[PDB]
Design an enzyme around this catalytic site. Sequence first.
Site, PDB file in Angstrom:
ATOM      1  N   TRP A   1     -14.856   2.021  24.724  1.00  0.00           N
ATOM      2  CA  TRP A   1     -14.120   3.088  24.047  1.00  0.00           C
ATOM      3  C   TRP A   1     -13.761   4.229  24.997  1.00  0.00           C
ATOM      4  CZ3 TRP A   1     -11.412   4.285  19.884  1.00  0.00           C
ATOM      5  CH2 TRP A   1     -11.258   5.625  19.500  1.00  0.00           C
TER       6      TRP A   1
ATOM      7  N   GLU B   1      -9.754  -0.943  24.709  1.00  0.00           N
ATOM      8  CA  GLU B   1      -9.631  -0.416  23.349  1.00  0.00           C
ATOM      9  C   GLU B   1      -8.526   0.636  23.353  1.00  0.00           C
ATOM     10  OE1 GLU B   1     -13.423   0.732  21.754  1.00  0.00           O
ATOM     11  OE2 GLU B   1     -14.461  -1.024  22.539  1.00  0.00           O
ATOM     12  N   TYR B   2      -7.296   0.217  23.056  1.00  0.00           N
ATOM     13  CA  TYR B   2      -6.838  -1.139  22.788  1.00  0.00           C
ATOM     14  C   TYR B   2      -5.423  -1.230  23.361  1.00  0.00           C
ATOM     15  CZ  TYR B   2     -10.073   0.179  19.020  1.00  0.00           C
ATOM     16  OH  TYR B   2     -11.095   0.745  18.288  1.00  0.00           O
TER      17      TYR B   2
ATOM     18  N   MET C   1     -15.001  -6.425  16.616  1.00  0.00           N
ATOM     19  CA  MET C   1     -15.807  -5.219  16.424  1.00  0.00           C
ATOM     20  C   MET C   1     -15.725  -4.783  14.958  1.00  0.00           C
ATOM     21  SD  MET C   1     -15.086  -3.278  20.038  1.00  0.00           S
ATOM     22  CE  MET C   1     -13.335  -3.199  19.745  1.00  0.00           C
ATOM     23  N   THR C   2     -16.398  -5.569  14.110  1.00  0.00           N
ATOM     24  CA  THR C   2     -16.476  -5.318  12.671  1.00  0.00           C
ATOM     25  C   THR C   2     -17.548  -4.268  12.361  1.00  0.00           C
ATOM     26  OG1 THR C   2     -17.779  -7.352  12.620  1.00  0.00           O
ATOM     27  CG2 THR C   2     -15.533  -7.478  11.806  1.00  0.00           C
ATOM     28  N   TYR C   3     -17.349  -3.084  12.929  1.00  0.00           N
ATOM     29  CA  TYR C   3     -18.191  -1.924  12.646  1.00  0.00           C
ATOM     30  C   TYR C   3     -17.357  -0.671  12.928  1.00  0.00           C
ATOM     31  CZ  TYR C   3     -19.208  -3.373  17.525  1.00  0.00           C
ATOM     32  OH  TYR C   3     -19.113  -3.843  18.823  1.00  0.00           O
TER      33      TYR C   3
ATOM     34  N   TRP D   1     -24.018  -4.754  18.765  1.00  0.00           N
ATOM     35  CA  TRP D   1     -23.918  -3.494  19.490  1.00  0.00           C
ATOM     36  C   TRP D   1     -25.020  -2.576  18.966  1.00  0.00           C
ATOM     37  CZ3 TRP D   1     -21.087  -2.300  23.675  1.00  0.00           C
ATOM     38  CH2 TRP D   1     -21.271  -1.002  24.157  1.00  0.00           C
TER      39      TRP D   1
HETATM   40  C1  LIG Z   1     -11.352   0.483  11.165  1.00  0.00           C
HETATM   41  C2  LIG Z   1     -11.096   1.433  12.388  1.00  0.00           C
HETATM   42  O1  LIG Z   1     -10.223   1.229  13.171  1.00  0.00           O
HETATM   43  N1  LIG Z   1     -11.950   2.545  12.514  1.00  0.00           N
HETATM   44  C3  LIG Z   1     -11.839   3.531  13.604  1.00  0.00           C
HETATM   45  C4  LIG Z   1     -13.165   3.569  14.399  1.00  0.00           C
HETATM   46  O2  LIG Z   1     -13.248   2.380  15.075  1.00  0.00           O
HETATM   47  C5  LIG Z   1     -13.082   4.658  15.445  1.00  0.00           C
HETATM   48  O3  LIG Z   1     -14.304   4.731  16.122  1.00  0.00           O
HETATM   49  C6  LIG Z   1     -14.390   3.904  17.256  1.00  0.00           C
HETATM   50  O4  LIG Z   1     -14.454   2.532  16.892  1.00  0.00           O
HETATM   51  C7  LIG Z   1     -14.523   1.643  18.023  1.00  0.00           C
HETATM   52  C8  LIG Z   1     -14.508   0.105  17.586  1.00  0.00           C
HETATM   53  O5  LIG Z   1     -13.203  -0.401  17.652  1.00  0.00           O
HETATM   54  C9  LIG Z   1     -15.816   1.971  18.866  1.00  0.00           C
HETATM   55  O6  LIG Z   1     -15.736   1.203  20.001  1.00  0.00           O
HETATM   56  C10 LIG Z   1     -15.821   3.476  19.286  1.00  0.00           C
HETATM   57  O7  LIG Z   1     -17.051   3.829  19.888  1.00  0.00           O
HETATM   58  C11 LIG Z   1     -15.686   4.329  18.020  1.00  0.00           C
HETATM   59  N2  LIG Z   1     -15.517   5.762  18.278  1.00  0.00           N
HETATM   60  C12 LIG Z   1     -16.288   6.672  17.556  1.00  0.00           C
HETATM   61  C13 LIG Z   1     -16.087   8.127  17.789  1.00  0.00           C
HETATM   62  O8  LIG Z   1     -17.078   6.308  16.755  1.00  0.00           O
HETATM   63  C14 LIG Z   1     -12.730   6.009  14.777  1.00  0.00           C
HETATM   64  C15 LIG Z   1     -12.517   7.102  15.909  1.00  0.00           C
HETATM   65  O9  LIG Z   1     -12.187   8.262  15.289  1.00  0.00           O
HETATM   66  O10 LIG Z   1     -11.556   5.941  14.026  1.00  0.00           O
HETATM   67  C16 LIG Z   1     -11.524   4.944  13.027  1.00  0.00           C
HETATM   68  O11 LIG Z   1     -10.220   4.883  12.560  1.00  0.00           O
HETATM   69  C1  LIG Z   2     -18.060  -4.078  22.227  1.00  0.00           C
HETATM   70  C2  LIG Z   2     -17.952  -2.560  21.750  1.00  0.00           C
HETATM   71  O1  LIG Z   2     -18.410  -2.234  20.693  1.00  0.00           O
HETATM   72  N1  LIG Z   2     -17.296  -1.602  22.554  1.00  0.00           N
HETATM   73  C3  LIG Z   2     -17.158  -0.160  22.089  1.00  0.00           C
HETATM   74  C4  LIG Z   2     -18.383   0.690  22.497  1.00  0.00           C
HETATM   75  O2  LIG Z   2     -17.894   1.425  23.550  1.00  0.00           O
HETATM   76  C5  LIG Z   2     -18.859   1.637  21.343  1.00  0.00           C
HETATM   77  O3  LIG Z   2     -20.013   2.366  21.761  1.00  0.00           O
HETATM   78  C6  LIG Z   2     -19.832   3.610  22.419  1.00  0.00           C
HETATM   79  O4  LIG Z   2     -19.623   3.346  23.783  1.00  0.00           O
HETATM   80  C7  LIG Z   2     -19.297   4.524  24.549  1.00  0.00           C
HETATM   81  C8  LIG Z   2     -18.696   4.087  25.931  1.00  0.00           C
HETATM   82  O5  LIG Z   2     -17.515   3.366  25.681  1.00  0.00           O
HETATM   83  C9  LIG Z   2     -20.592   5.407  24.633  1.00  0.00           C
HETATM   84  O6  LIG Z   2     -20.344   6.546  25.342  1.00  0.00           O
HETATM   85  C10 LIG Z   2     -20.994   5.828  23.166  1.00  0.00           C
HETATM   86  O7  LIG Z   2     -22.220   6.515  23.208  1.00  0.00           O
HETATM   87  C11 LIG Z   2     -21.136   4.546  22.247  1.00  0.00           C
HETATM   88  N2  LIG Z   2     -21.279   4.886  20.785  1.00  0.00           N
HETATM   89  C12 LIG Z   2     -22.223   4.183  19.988  1.00  0.00           C
HETATM   90  C13 LIG Z   2     -22.350   4.496  18.495  1.00  0.00           C
HETATM   91  O8  LIG Z   2     -22.893   3.332  20.471  1.00  0.00           O
HETATM   92  C14 LIG Z   2     -19.191   0.730  20.080  1.00  0.00           C
HETATM   93  C15 LIG Z   2     -19.865   1.511  18.825  1.00  0.00           C
HETATM   94  O9  LIG Z   2     -19.037   2.473  18.271  1.00  0.00           O
HETATM   95  O10 LIG Z   2     -18.064   0.012  19.650  1.00  0.00           O
HETATM   96  C16 LIG Z   2     -16.905  -0.053  20.499  1.00  0.00           C
HETATM   97  O11 LIG Z   2     -16.226   1.120  20.214  1.00  0.00           O
END
Ligand SMILES: CC(=O)N[C@@H]1[C@@H](O)[C@H](O[C@@H]2O[C@H](CO)[C@@H](O)[C@H](O)[C@H]2NC(C)=O)[C@@H](CO)O[C@H]1O
Ligand SMILES: CC(=O)N[C@@H]1[C@@H](O)[C@H](O[C@@H]2O[C@H](CO)[C@@H](O)[C@H](O)[C@H]2NC(C)=O)[C@@H](CO)O[C@H]1O
EC number: 3.2.1.14
Length: 369
Positions: free
Chosen positions: A78, A119-120, A189-191, A339
Amino acid sequence: YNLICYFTNWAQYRPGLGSFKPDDINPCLCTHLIYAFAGMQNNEITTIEWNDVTLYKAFNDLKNRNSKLKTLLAIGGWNFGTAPFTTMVSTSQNRQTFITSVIKFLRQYGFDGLDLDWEYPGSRGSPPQDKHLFTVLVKEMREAFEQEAIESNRPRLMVTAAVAGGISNIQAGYEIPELSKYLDFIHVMTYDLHGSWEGYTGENSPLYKYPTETGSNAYLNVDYVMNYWKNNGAPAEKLIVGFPEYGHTFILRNPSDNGIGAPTSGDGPAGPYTRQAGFWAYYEICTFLRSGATEVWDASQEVPYAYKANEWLGYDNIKSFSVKAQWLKQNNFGGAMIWAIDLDDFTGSFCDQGKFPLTSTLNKALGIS
Ligand SMILES: CC(=O)N[C@@H]1[C@@H](O)[C@H](O[C@@H]2O[C@H](CO)[C@@H](O)[C@H](O)[C@H]2NC(C)=O)[C@@H](CO)O[C@H]1O
Ligand SMILES: CC(=O)N[C@@H]1[C@@H](O)[C@H](O[C@@H]2O[C@H](CO)[C@@H](O)[C@H](O)[C@H]2NC(C)=O)[C@@H](CO)O[C@H]1O
Protein backbone atom coordinates in the site's frame (compact mmCIF):
# COMPACT_ATOMS: atom_id res chain seq x y z
CA TYR A 1 -4.89 -26.38 -0.43
CA ASN A 2 -2.26 -23.70 0.08
CA LEU A 3 -1.83 -21.54 3.17
CA ILE A 4 0.16 -18.42 2.25
CA CYS A 5 1.46 -16.35 5.17
CA TYR A 6 2.78 -12.81 4.92
CA PHE A 7 5.61 -11.67 7.19
CA THR A 8 6.35 -7.94 7.58
CA ASN A 9 9.90 -6.65 7.95
CA TRP A 10 8.84 -3.74 10.21
CA ALA A 11 7.23 -5.95 12.88
CA GLN A 12 10.72 -6.20 14.40
CA TYR A 13 10.37 -2.62 15.66
CA ARG A 14 7.22 -3.08 17.74
CA PRO A 15 7.74 -2.64 21.50
CA GLY A 16 8.10 -5.47 23.98
CA LEU A 17 6.33 -8.69 23.08
CA GLY A 18 5.13 -7.20 19.77
CA SER A 19 8.60 -7.60 18.25
CA PHE A 20 8.60 -10.32 15.56
CA LYS A 21 11.32 -11.75 13.30
CA PRO A 22 11.40 -14.79 11.00
CA ASP A 23 12.80 -17.04 13.73
CA ASP A 24 9.44 -16.56 15.49
CA ILE A 25 7.65 -18.30 12.59
CA ASN A 26 6.58 -21.93 13.06
CA PRO A 27 7.89 -23.45 9.80
CA CYS A 28 5.13 -26.09 9.64
CA LEU A 29 2.09 -23.76 9.77
CA CYS A 30 2.02 -22.53 6.14
CA THR A 31 2.78 -23.89 2.69
CA HIS A 32 4.18 -20.56 1.46
CA LEU A 33 5.78 -17.65 3.33
CA ILE A 34 5.84 -14.23 1.67
CA TYR A 35 8.29 -11.52 2.77
CA ALA A 36 6.76 -8.02 2.84
CA PHE A 37 8.34 -5.91 1.32
CA ALA A 38 11.10 -5.26 -1.13
CA GLY A 39 11.33 -1.86 -2.79
CA MET A 40 12.56 -0.46 -6.09
CA GLN A 41 15.33 1.93 -7.13
CA ASN A 42 16.26 2.92 -10.71
CA ASN A 43 13.85 0.20 -11.93
CA GLU A 44 15.60 -2.52 -9.87
CA ILE A 45 14.36 -4.45 -6.83
CA THR A 46 16.14 -3.55 -3.58
CA THR A 47 16.08 -4.07 0.16
CA ILE A 48 14.38 -1.45 2.35
CA GLU A 49 15.50 -2.37 5.90
CA TRP A 50 19.11 -2.26 7.11
CA ASN A 51 18.94 -5.93 8.16
CA ASP A 52 16.85 -7.30 5.28
CA VAL A 53 19.70 -9.52 4.08
CA THR A 54 19.92 -11.04 7.56
CA LEU A 55 16.18 -11.54 7.75
CA TYR A 56 16.11 -13.07 4.25
CA LYS A 57 18.55 -15.71 5.52
CA ALA A 58 16.53 -16.33 8.69
CA PHE A 59 13.36 -16.47 6.57
CA ASN A 60 14.65 -18.94 3.98
CA ASP A 61 16.41 -20.98 6.69
CA LEU A 62 12.89 -21.94 7.84
CA LYS A 63 12.97 -24.35 4.90
CA ASN A 64 15.58 -26.29 6.92
CA ARG A 65 12.64 -27.50 9.05
CA ASN A 66 10.04 -28.02 6.31
CA SER A 67 11.12 -29.41 2.92
CA LYS A 68 7.72 -28.59 1.43
CA LEU A 69 7.87 -24.89 2.35
CA LYS A 70 8.25 -22.28 -0.38
CA THR A 71 9.11 -18.61 0.06
CA LEU A 72 8.34 -15.55 -2.03
CA LEU A 73 9.44 -11.92 -1.85
CA ALA A 74 6.68 -9.31 -2.14
CA ILE A 75 7.47 -5.98 -3.84
CA GLY A 76 5.38 -2.86 -3.30
CA GLY A 77 2.53 -2.70 -0.82
CA TRP A 78 0.00 0.00 0.00
CA ASN A 79 2.52 2.61 1.17
CA PHE A 80 4.73 2.10 -1.91
CA GLY A 81 2.23 3.98 -4.04
CA THR A 82 2.23 3.62 -7.80
CA ALA A 83 4.67 6.07 -9.43
CA PRO A 84 7.72 3.73 -9.45
CA PHE A 85 5.59 0.93 -10.94
CA THR A 86 4.15 3.29 -13.57
CA THR A 87 7.66 4.38 -14.60
CA MET A 88 8.97 0.82 -14.57
CA VAL A 89 6.27 -0.67 -16.82
CA SER A 90 6.18 2.33 -19.20
CA THR A 91 8.92 0.99 -21.52
CA SER A 92 10.15 -2.47 -22.51
CA GLN A 93 13.67 -1.47 -21.45
CA ASN A 94 12.58 -0.49 -17.93
CA ARG A 95 10.64 -3.76 -17.59
CA GLN A 96 13.68 -5.77 -18.69
CA THR A 97 15.89 -3.95 -16.18
CA PHE A 98 13.40 -4.84 -13.44
CA ILE A 99 12.83 -8.48 -14.44
CA THR A 100 16.57 -9.07 -14.74
CA SER A 101 17.16 -7.53 -11.30
CA VAL A 102 14.37 -9.69 -9.82
CA ILE A 103 15.83 -12.97 -11.13
CA LYS A 104 19.29 -12.24 -9.73
CA PHE A 105 17.87 -11.00 -6.42
CA LEU A 106 15.55 -13.95 -5.79
CA ARG A 107 18.20 -16.54 -6.68
CA GLN A 108 20.92 -14.84 -4.62
CA TYR A 109 18.87 -14.65 -1.41
CA GLY A 110 17.01 -17.96 -1.62
CA PHE A 111 13.47 -17.01 -2.67
CA ASP A 112 11.25 -19.25 -4.80
CA GLY A 113 9.30 -16.44 -6.46
CA LEU A 114 7.99 -12.89 -6.57
CA ASP A 115 4.66 -11.54 -5.26
CA LEU A 116 3.74 -8.35 -7.14
CA ASP A 117 1.89 -5.99 -4.77
CA TRP A 118 1.16 -2.95 -6.94
CA GLU A 119 -1.81 -1.19 -5.31
CA TYR A 120 -3.04 -0.64 -7.93
CA PRO A 121 -2.57 -0.37 -11.70
CA GLY A 122 -4.97 2.27 -12.95
CA SER A 123 -5.74 3.77 -9.51
CA ARG A 124 -4.12 6.03 -6.91
CA GLY A 125 -2.44 8.13 -9.60
CA SER A 126 -1.56 5.31 -12.01
CA PRO A 127 -2.77 6.24 -15.55
CA PRO A 128 -5.25 4.08 -17.50
CA GLN A 129 -2.59 2.47 -19.71
CA ASP A 130 -1.20 0.65 -16.66
CA LYS A 131 -4.13 -1.77 -16.74
CA HIS A 132 -2.77 -3.36 -19.91
CA LEU A 133 0.89 -2.68 -19.08
CA PHE A 134 0.46 -4.65 -15.85
CA THR A 135 -0.56 -7.61 -18.01
CA VAL A 136 2.50 -7.03 -20.19
CA LEU A 137 4.76 -6.96 -17.14
CA VAL A 138 3.34 -10.20 -15.75
CA LYS A 139 3.50 -11.94 -19.12
CA GLU A 140 7.10 -10.87 -19.70
CA MET A 141 8.04 -11.86 -16.15
CA ARG A 142 6.37 -15.26 -16.46
CA GLU A 143 8.23 -15.82 -19.73
CA ALA A 144 11.53 -14.63 -18.28
CA PHE A 145 11.07 -17.02 -15.36
CA GLU A 146 10.47 -19.93 -17.73
CA GLN A 147 13.62 -19.04 -19.68
CA GLU A 148 15.72 -18.70 -16.51
CA ALA A 149 14.58 -22.15 -15.39
CA ILE A 150 15.85 -23.47 -18.73
CA GLU A 151 19.08 -21.47 -18.49
CA SER A 152 19.91 -22.42 -14.88
CA ASN A 153 18.38 -25.95 -14.84
CA ARG A 154 16.40 -25.10 -11.69
CA PRO A 155 12.64 -25.25 -11.09
CA ARG A 156 10.92 -22.11 -12.33
CA LEU A 157 10.52 -19.11 -10.06
CA MET A 158 6.87 -18.41 -9.23
CA VAL A 159 5.11 -15.16 -10.11
CA THR A 160 2.09 -14.23 -7.99
CA ALA A 161 0.19 -11.02 -7.34
CA ALA A 162 -1.75 -9.47 -4.49
CA VAL A 163 -4.81 -7.90 -6.09
CA ALA A 164 -7.54 -5.47 -5.16
CA GLY A 165 -10.71 -6.47 -3.36
CA GLY A 166 -12.58 -3.28 -4.29
CA ILE A 167 -14.61 -3.55 -7.47
CA SER A 168 -13.79 -0.15 -8.96
CA ASN A 169 -10.08 -0.85 -8.40
CA ILE A 170 -10.44 -4.30 -9.99
CA GLN A 171 -12.26 -2.82 -12.98
CA ALA A 172 -9.64 -0.11 -13.48
CA GLY A 173 -6.64 -2.33 -12.88
CA TYR A 174 -6.78 -5.87 -14.26
CA GLU A 175 -7.24 -7.75 -17.55
CA ILE A 176 -8.41 -10.80 -15.62
CA PRO A 177 -8.56 -13.46 -18.39
CA GLU A 178 -5.07 -12.69 -19.72
CA LEU A 179 -3.47 -11.97 -16.34
CA SER A 180 -4.85 -15.23 -14.92
CA LYS A 181 -3.09 -17.24 -17.62
CA TYR A 182 0.36 -16.06 -16.51
CA LEU A 183 0.14 -15.69 -12.72
CA ASP A 184 0.71 -18.82 -10.64
CA PHE A 185 -1.56 -17.58 -7.84
CA ILE A 186 -3.84 -14.59 -7.34
CA HIS A 187 -3.89 -13.36 -3.74
CA VAL A 188 -7.21 -11.51 -3.40
CA MET A 189 -7.12 -8.88 -0.64
CA THR A 190 -10.61 -9.62 0.72
CA TYR A 191 -10.17 -7.37 3.75
CA ASP A 192 -10.26 -3.65 4.61
CA LEU A 193 -13.78 -3.88 3.17
CA HIS A 194 -15.12 -1.50 5.85
CA GLY A 195 -13.29 0.92 8.14
CA SER A 196 -13.39 4.31 9.81
CA TRP A 197 -13.03 6.01 6.41
CA GLU A 198 -16.73 5.34 5.76
CA GLY A 199 -18.02 7.27 8.78
CA TYR A 200 -19.90 4.30 10.26
CA THR A 201 -19.13 0.86 11.66
CA GLY A 202 -18.63 -2.17 9.45
CA GLU A 203 -16.80 -5.46 9.26
CA ASN A 204 -13.24 -5.83 7.99
CA SER A 205 -13.80 -9.11 6.13
CA PRO A 206 -17.46 -10.17 6.16
CA LEU A 207 -18.12 -13.37 4.25
CA TYR A 208 -21.58 -12.26 3.02
CA LYS A 209 -23.33 -8.93 2.56
CA TYR A 210 -25.38 -7.43 5.38
CA PRO A 211 -29.09 -8.05 4.69
CA THR A 212 -29.99 -4.42 3.87
CA GLU A 213 -26.99 -3.72 1.61
CA THR A 214 -27.79 -3.02 -2.06
CA GLY A 215 -25.85 -1.93 -5.11
CA SER A 216 -22.19 -1.07 -4.58
CA ASN A 217 -22.42 -1.57 -0.81
CA ALA A 218 -23.25 -5.21 -1.61
CA TYR A 219 -19.82 -5.67 -3.24
CA LEU A 220 -18.12 -5.36 0.16
CA ASN A 221 -17.96 -9.03 1.13
CA VAL A 222 -15.66 -11.99 0.50
CA ASP A 223 -18.27 -13.99 -1.41
CA TYR A 224 -18.91 -11.26 -3.99
CA VAL A 225 -15.24 -10.34 -4.46
CA MET A 226 -13.99 -13.91 -4.94
CA ASN A 227 -16.82 -14.77 -7.33
CA TYR A 228 -16.17 -11.56 -9.25
CA TRP A 229 -12.62 -12.75 -9.96
CA LYS A 230 -13.75 -16.29 -10.72
CA ASN A 231 -16.52 -15.26 -13.12
CA ASN A 232 -14.43 -12.65 -14.98
CA GLY A 233 -11.66 -15.02 -16.06
CA ALA A 234 -9.72 -16.38 -13.07
CA PRO A 235 -9.67 -20.16 -12.48
CA ALA A 236 -10.78 -20.97 -8.96
CA GLU A 237 -7.71 -23.13 -8.29
CA LYS A 238 -5.44 -20.08 -8.73
CA LEU A 239 -7.55 -17.83 -6.47
CA ILE A 240 -6.43 -17.42 -2.87
CA VAL A 241 -8.81 -15.91 -0.30
CA GLY A 242 -7.48 -13.15 1.94
CA PHE A 243 -7.76 -13.57 5.71
CA PRO A 244 -6.93 -10.67 8.07
CA GLU A 245 -5.34 -11.43 11.47
CA TYR A 246 -6.24 -7.88 12.57
CA GLY A 247 -9.42 -5.86 12.95
CA HIS A 248 -10.49 -2.28 12.34
CA THR A 249 -11.37 0.13 15.15
CA PHE A 250 -13.94 2.92 15.29
CA ILE A 251 -15.08 5.59 17.74
CA LEU A 252 -18.87 5.58 18.09
CA ARG A 253 -20.58 8.95 18.02
CA ASN A 254 -23.02 7.58 20.61
CA PRO A 255 -22.17 4.43 22.61
CA SER A 256 -25.85 3.35 22.60
CA ASP A 257 -25.75 3.16 18.77
CA ASN A 258 -23.42 0.18 18.46
CA GLY A 259 -24.72 -2.09 15.69
CA ILE A 260 -23.51 -2.54 12.13
CA GLY A 261 -23.67 0.83 10.37
CA ALA A 262 -23.65 2.94 13.54
CA PRO A 263 -22.20 6.44 12.95
CA THR A 264 -18.55 6.98 13.88
CA SER A 265 -16.05 9.84 14.04
CA GLY A 266 -12.33 10.18 13.41
CA ASP A 267 -9.80 7.49 12.49
CA GLY A 268 -10.31 5.10 15.41
CA PRO A 269 -8.07 4.19 18.35
CA ALA A 270 -4.50 2.86 18.09
CA GLY A 271 -3.11 -0.13 19.96
CA PRO A 272 0.01 -0.05 22.17
CA TYR A 273 2.04 -2.45 19.96
CA THR A 274 0.93 -1.61 16.40
CA ARG A 275 0.55 2.10 17.23
CA GLN A 276 -1.61 2.95 14.19
CA ALA A 277 -5.03 4.59 14.40
CA GLY A 278 -7.77 2.36 13.11
CA PHE A 279 -6.45 -1.18 13.52
CA TRP A 280 -5.48 -3.69 16.19
CA ALA A 281 -3.54 -6.93 15.88
CA TYR A 282 -5.37 -10.06 16.97
CA TYR A 283 -3.28 -10.21 20.15
CA GLU A 284 -4.32 -6.61 20.87
CA ILE A 285 -7.96 -7.53 20.20
CA CYS A 286 -7.69 -10.25 22.84
CA THR A 287 -6.74 -7.68 25.48
CA PHE A 288 -9.84 -5.64 24.55
CA LEU A 289 -12.15 -8.67 24.76
CA ARG A 290 -10.71 -9.95 28.07
CA SER A 291 -11.25 -6.49 29.61
CA GLY A 292 -15.02 -6.80 29.31
CA ALA A 293 -16.00 -5.70 25.81
CA THR A 294 -19.43 -6.79 24.62
CA GLU A 295 -19.03 -9.42 21.89
CA VAL A 296 -21.61 -9.85 19.11
CA TRP A 297 -21.86 -12.45 16.36
CA ASP A 298 -22.90 -10.78 13.09
CA ALA A 299 -24.81 -13.88 12.03
CA SER A 300 -25.61 -12.75 8.48
CA GLN A 301 -21.95 -12.02 7.68
CA GLU A 302 -20.34 -14.80 9.78
CA VAL A 303 -17.93 -12.53 11.66
CA PRO A 304 -17.71 -11.08 15.17
CA TYR A 305 -17.75 -7.53 16.35
CA ALA A 306 -17.24 -6.08 19.81
CA TYR A 307 -17.59 -2.78 21.60
CA LYS A 308 -16.85 -1.14 24.92
CA ALA A 309 -17.96 2.39 25.78
CA ASN A 310 -17.46 4.32 22.52
CA GLU A 311 -14.89 1.91 21.01
CA TRP A 312 -16.13 -0.49 18.31
CA LEU A 313 -14.17 -3.28 16.64
CA GLY A 314 -14.83 -5.25 13.44
CA TYR A 315 -12.63 -8.31 13.33
CA ASP A 316 -12.12 -12.06 12.81
CA ASN A 317 -11.69 -14.88 15.31
CA ILE A 318 -11.37 -18.65 15.36
CA LYS A 319 -15.03 -19.15 14.45
CA SER A 320 -15.06 -16.73 11.50
CA PHE A 321 -11.82 -18.15 10.11
CA SER A 322 -13.36 -21.63 10.39
CA VAL A 323 -16.53 -20.58 8.57
CA LYS A 324 -14.64 -18.89 5.73
CA ALA A 325 -12.18 -21.77 5.40
CA GLN A 326 -15.05 -24.22 4.93
CA TRP A 327 -16.60 -21.77 2.47
CA LEU A 328 -13.46 -21.43 0.35
CA LYS A 329 -12.97 -25.20 0.28
CA GLN A 330 -16.57 -25.86 -0.78
CA ASN A 331 -16.13 -23.24 -3.53
CA ASN A 332 -13.00 -24.97 -4.91
CA PHE A 333 -10.57 -22.11 -4.29
CA GLY A 334 -6.86 -22.75 -4.11
CA GLY A 335 -6.45 -21.84 -0.45
CA ALA A 336 -6.01 -18.89 1.90
CA MET A 337 -3.49 -16.14 2.54
CA ILE A 338 -3.11 -14.28 5.81
CA TRP A 339 -2.17 -10.66 6.46
CA ALA A 340 -0.04 -11.07 8.55
CA ILE A 341 1.45 -13.83 10.73
CA ASP A 342 3.13 -11.31 13.02
CA LEU A 343 -0.39 -10.08 13.95
CA ASP A 344 -1.49 -13.48 15.33
CA ASP A 345 -0.97 -14.29 19.01
CA PHE A 346 2.35 -15.89 18.09
CA THR A 347 3.56 -16.17 21.71
CA GLY A 348 0.19 -17.53 22.90
CA SER A 349 0.33 -15.21 25.91
CA PHE A 350 -2.41 -12.71 24.95
CA CYS A 351 -5.43 -14.81 23.98
CA ASP A 352 -5.04 -18.04 26.00
CA GLN A 353 -5.81 -19.95 22.78
CA GLY A 354 -2.36 -21.45 22.19
CA LYS A 355 0.35 -20.33 19.80
CA PHE A 356 -0.75 -18.81 16.47
CA PRO A 357 -4.47 -19.43 17.16
CA LEU A 358 -5.79 -17.92 13.92
CA THR A 359 -3.06 -19.35 11.69
CA SER A 360 -3.41 -22.79 13.34
CA THR A 361 -7.15 -22.71 12.62
CA LEU A 362 -6.48 -22.42 8.87
CA ASN A 363 -3.66 -24.98 9.00
CA LYS A 364 -6.11 -27.50 10.44
CA ALA A 365 -9.07 -26.57 8.24
CA LEU A 366 -7.02 -26.69 5.02
CA GLY A 367 -5.25 -29.98 5.78
CA ILE A 368 -1.80 -28.38 5.71
CA SER A 369 -0.22 -30.63 8.36
C1 LIG B 1 -13.21 -2.32 -0.73
C2 LIG B 1 -12.07 -1.25 -0.79
O1 LIG B 1 -11.52 -0.96 -1.81
N1 LIG B 1 -11.72 -0.62 0.42
C3 LIG B 1 -10.68 0.41 0.54
C4 LIG B 1 -9.59 -0.07 1.52
O2 LIG B 1 -8.93 -1.10 0.90
C5 LIG B 1 -8.58 1.03 1.72
O3 LIG B 1 -7.62 0.62 2.65
C6 LIG B 1 -6.51 -0.05 2.10
O4 LIG B 1 -6.87 -1.33 1.61
C7 LIG B 1 -5.77 -2.04 1.02
C8 LIG B 1 -6.22 -3.45 0.40
O5 LIG B 1 -6.48 -3.31 -0.97
C9 LIG B 1 -4.64 -2.25 2.10
O6 LIG B 1 -3.57 -2.79 1.43
C10 LIG B 1 -4.21 -0.87 2.69
O7 LIG B 1 -3.32 -1.04 3.78
C11 LIG B 1 -5.46 -0.17 3.25
N2 LIG B 1 -5.22 1.21 3.69
C12 LIG B 1 -5.73 1.60 4.93
C13 LIG B 1 -5.52 3.01 5.37
O8 LIG B 1 -6.32 0.85 5.63
C14 LIG B 1 -9.29 2.33 2.17
C15 LIG B 1 -8.22 3.51 2.24
O9 LIG B 1 -8.89 4.63 2.62
O10 LIG B 1 -10.30 2.72 1.30
C16 LIG B 1 -11.29 1.75 1.04
O11 LIG B 1 -12.06 2.23 -0.01
C1 LIG C 1 -0.93 -8.31 0.54
C2 LIG C 1 -1.40 -6.95 1.24
O1 LIG C 1 -2.31 -6.97 2.02
N1 LIG C 1 -0.76 -5.73 0.93
C3 LIG C 1 -1.22 -4.43 1.57
C4 LIG C 1 -0.52 -4.18 2.93
O2 LIG C 1 0.40 -3.21 2.61
C5 LIG C 1 -1.51 -3.66 4.02
O3 LIG C 1 -0.82 -3.49 5.26
C6 LIG C 1 -0.20 -2.23 5.52
O4 LIG C 1 1.07 -2.25 4.92
C7 LIG C 1 1.75 -0.98 5.01
C8 LIG C 1 2.94 -0.97 3.99
O5 LIG C 1 2.40 -1.11 2.70
C9 LIG C 1 2.16 -0.76 6.51
O6 LIG C 1 2.80 0.43 6.66
C10 LIG C 1 0.84 -0.70 7.37
O7 LIG C 1 1.18 -0.63 8.73
C11 LIG C 1 -0.04 -2.00 7.11
N2 LIG C 1 -1.42 -1.90 7.71
C12 LIG C 1 -1.98 -3.02 8.38
C13 LIG C 1 -3.39 -2.94 8.97
O8 LIG C 1 -1.36 -4.03 8.47
C14 LIG C 1 -2.67 -4.74 4.18
C15 LIG C 1 -3.71 -4.46 5.39
O9 LIG C 1 -4.44 -3.29 5.24
O10 LIG C 1 -3.37 -4.92 2.97
C16 LIG C 1 -2.82 -4.38 1.76
O11 LIG C 1 -3.25 -3.06 1.77
